[PDB]
Curated annotation (Swiss-Prot):
Keywords: Amyloid, Amyloidosis, Antimicrobial, Bacteriolytic enzyme, Disease variant, Disulfide bond, Glycosidase, Hydrolase, Secreted, Signal. Belongs to the glycosyl hydrolase 22 family. The gene is LYZ. This is Lysozyme C. Disulfide bonds join C6-C128, C30-C116, C65-C81, C77-C95. One of its GO terms (biological process) is inflammatory response. It comes from Homo sapiens (Human).
Length: 130
């Protein structure tokens, strides 16, 4: 599924993402925007280390989900990476929450650092009713 902007903002809010561990909804939106263009079936293979990024947040298989083909990988979210390719993003948000409970928080995603950190991200939630 490819979410429309405000549709996603309210979907994330309903799943408890607004302010989760001090991270604003606008930040999660900016993350999803730059990671996959709000596309839940987005995937990216990383030839260098044999891991794959999954879903709307492009979560990596080396540490977060199990795809069975990533060498020495772990599954901290305790999910099959397939769960991160669903139209329903409940599991993907559960895992995104798991990621941010770690020390880095939202900084876990380099894309967030490159396009969201210290940026005016208000535009992501404007007019969505969140």
């Amino acid at each position: 599924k490819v979410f429309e902007r405000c549709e996603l903002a309210r979907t994330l809010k309903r799943l408890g993402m607004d302010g989760y561990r001090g991270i604003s909804l606008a930040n999660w939106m900016c993350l999803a925007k730059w990671e996959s263009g709000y596309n839940t079936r987005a995937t990216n293979y990383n030839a260098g280390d044999r891991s794959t990024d999954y879903g709307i947040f492009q979560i990596n298989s080396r540490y977060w989900c199990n795809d069975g083909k990533t060498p020495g990988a772990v599954n901290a979210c305790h999910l099959s990476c397939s769960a991160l390719l669903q139209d329903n993003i409940a599991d993907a948000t559960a895992c995104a929450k798991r990621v941010v409970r770690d020390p880095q928080g939202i900084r876990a995603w380099v894309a967030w650092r490159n396009r969201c950190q210290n940026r005016d991200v208000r535009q992501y939630v404007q007019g969505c009713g969140v």
